[PDB]
Amino acid sequence: IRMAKNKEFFDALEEIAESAKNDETLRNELAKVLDDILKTDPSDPEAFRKIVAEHQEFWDEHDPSLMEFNEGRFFGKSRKQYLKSDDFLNSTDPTYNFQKLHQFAAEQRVKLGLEKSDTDTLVAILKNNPEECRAYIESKKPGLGNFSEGNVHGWLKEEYTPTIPPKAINKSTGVLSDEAIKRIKEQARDLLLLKLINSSGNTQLLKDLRDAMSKPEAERAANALGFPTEGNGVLFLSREVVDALEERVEKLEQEAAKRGFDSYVQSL
């Protein structure tokens, strides 16, 4: 058991995002909830408790436990009072405080937008370094969130690395940490691999990836499938990608057997 609902809201954001993977209506609803959280100053605990509680209708549709107020404990407190206390959302939480919830929300908002993003954006996430990634995410507004000054609290002014042309960089590590960018790249990796797998008809190449026994072997196959070498640093085969690989090879082999049979059954 944990004090207050802080951790439950963390896990709820992830699990609702999961349920939104193929539910476009829920995606838009969750995007608005995340957008509202991100525009709120997490060092203003009253404004932050208020923006979370203001979406009670949304939270109730997914887990009534988040907004549940058992008047058995906290008996001297009304519901309106509880929703403003640390017993609802603990601002001094050692682990899941409002700053961490804000930072988590920024990462989820990007991943939410990545889900249906095109190939080129997945590749851009893998090719850009973390500073470049933050600026690129701003460039995609609002597809990956409204990451811009005044619309996400603490988002910094865009800077530039003096190449020709200047490359946009953003140093808002207090909003999207380097570790959040790393997990964003891991999700982009999986999303892109799944696209390349579905588009490929090269059964042997897909088998080479499916049967890879080491990272160099996986790199050679994935790169031949179109995965960018700039993503090799984060290349790791996850459960979902392995499962897609097995099913795709099986489908291609069934289809190949149905044709090789017919090219023979009416031939002779």
Numbering used by the authors: 7 to 274
What does the published report state?
Using this approach, we obtained well-diffracting crystals of the N-terminal 29 kDa fragment (aa 2–281) belonging to space group I422 with one molecule in the asymmetric unit. The structure of RidL2–281 was solved at 1.9-Å resolution. The electron densities allowed for building a model comprising residues 7–274. The structure features a “foot-like” fold, consisting primarily of interacting bundles of α-helices connected by loops of various lengths. Thereby, the side chain of the conserved Ile170 forms an exposed hydrophobic spot.
The effector RidL binds the Vps29 retromer subunit, blocks retrograde vesicle trafficking, and promotes intracellular bacterial replication. Here, we show that the 29-kDa N-terminal domain of RidL (RidL2–281) adopts a “foot-like” fold comprising a protruding hydrophobic β-hairpin, which determines the interaction with the Vps29 retromer subunit and displaces the regulator TBC1D5 from the retromer. Thus, the hydrophobic β-hairpin of RidL is critical for binding of the L. pneumophila effector to the Vps29 retromer subunit and displacement of the regulator TBC1D5.
